[PDB]
């Protein structure tokens, strides 16, 4: 399945296995040096969350003071 991971202020697609889930995805991104939250549809993704192919995941990174606005 395909997953469009959106970075703080950037966009980058990701190739996932069949019937993949937030678990596998989180792993791929986790493998890298950076590690931020990955939620979609304005809601957090469950470890067993399985959307589908050609999906979109919003990657939110931690900031100072969380974020007022």
CB-CB contact of 3 with 16 (8 Å): yes
Burial class (CB in 10 A: 0-12, 13-18, 19+), 25: buried
Q: Is the dihedral of CA 60, 24, 10, 57 positive or negative?
A: negative
CB-CB contact of 6 with 59 (8 Å): yes
Domains and CATH numbers, the chain: 1-69 (3.10.20.30)
Strand blocks (E) in 1-69: 2-7, 10-15, 37-40, 43-44, 55-60
β-bridge partners, 28? none
**DSSP secondary structure letter of residue 53:** S
Each as own residue / partner, the long-range contacts of residues 38-45 (CB below 8 Å, 24 or more positions apart, any chain) are: 38/5
Beta carbons within 8 Å of 2's beta carbon, 6+ residues apart: 13, 14, 15, 16, 53, 54, 55
Q: What are the angstrom distances between the C-alpha of 47 and each of 9, 24, 63, 65, 69? A: 25, 8, 23, 27, 28
């Amino acid at each position: 399945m395909l997953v469009i991971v959106r970075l703080q202020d950037q966009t980058l697609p990701f190739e996932l296995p069949a019937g993949a889930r937030a678990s596998q995805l989180s792993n791929l991104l986790s493998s890298s040096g950076m590690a931020f939250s990955l939620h979609t549809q304005g809601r957090v993704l469950s470890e067993a969350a399985e959307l589908n192919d050609k999906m979109v995941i919003d990657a939110f990174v931690p900031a100072d003071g969380a974020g007022l606005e």
